[PDB]
Amino acid sequence: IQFLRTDDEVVLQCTATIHKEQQKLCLAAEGFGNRLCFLESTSNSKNVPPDLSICTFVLEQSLSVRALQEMLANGHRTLLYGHAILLRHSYSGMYLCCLSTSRSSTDKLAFDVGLQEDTTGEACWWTIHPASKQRSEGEKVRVGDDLILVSVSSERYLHLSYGNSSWHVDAAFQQTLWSVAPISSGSEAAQGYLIGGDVLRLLHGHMDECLTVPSGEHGEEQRRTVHYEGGAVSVHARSLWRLETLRVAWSGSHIRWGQPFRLRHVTTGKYLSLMEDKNLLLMDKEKADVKSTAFAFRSSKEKLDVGVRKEVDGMGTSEIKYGDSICYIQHVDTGLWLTYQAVDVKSARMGS
Amino acid sequence: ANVVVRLLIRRPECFGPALRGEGGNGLLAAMEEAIKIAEDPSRDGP
């Protein structure tokens, strides 16, 4: 029932039936190093999490085709069918567009989609059209509605061109239902409160001990180790942890206490998993099971609440602040709690 | 012209199968196959 406004991060999802199996795929793009776009399996997240950081897109502007043409000649607005929307990548900062190059020689009539830096020209904007008979032009868009994206210059639909091994999105003349899932509606997110889908660092109140991993001085086998450090490591890049929410809708909502989420190390790309045979380690997305990677934040040390909440459709309530907040990490399976130790021998303790 | 082009590009099967689609290469091979069929009377109506 919520109407898509402007300056809100969304996700372009769609359905794909291959091998008599249905799957949910969102439109993602690396941006830095690769301009062309690809797909990310948003479904099947219990075993492998998707890359929402590159899957989300934000609506920069929302103008009609005629106002857009007048712009070519020369707050938070709502989204209506028939407008010429503008999609900007969240992380890469570039803008989704329709490239004039053809990579797949099979569809000799389609184009390739990708990201571009400049917003000039009518080769970057996209128009939304109704996909079902129950809706028509001129109506307000709501959450969960299936729409059709059409290029302005290319005049080609955002088609999900099926291939043997190339699941690539093209700008073809075959309509494809692109469902839109919100992430962050741009509500009154007060500066300092915790927002989901964000990367942060964890310090101590009286010890400023940051949760880090060994640097590139040794190999990945050493870098998989997790420990505490201090000093200049607080401003380094190997001390950043991203909180990925399980649900793909409203993933950038306000983090509430006790909900599961994955910890990702953006420096190496591995997820913080816990194998009870040892301490916690870093395992990649291919084997990052939700029962071993999903952690939660509590306000106390007790285990009073486990099976309480499952999902809340909304932006959420501002609960956790960045300034003054004492959270406690807790696992969904074992329910252990963090503790600092003195495993370091007295041989070279003061220096290391 | 604009509206007919729109309709013809939205419905790709209006063109020949040997010219448009993931099958036949293009108009060249299409017309060469057509000439071959015209020369070989085994592909007509007796």
Next chain:
Amino acid sequence: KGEAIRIRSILRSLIPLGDLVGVISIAFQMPEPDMSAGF
């Protein structure tokens, strides 16, 4: 006009140029009369 440019680009992507010249170059036979129901 830009719409004309887009339509021309669509037509060019539909029908290539080498295709056109290859189909033009067939050198039809010129005949004893023959049939005009062929190429």
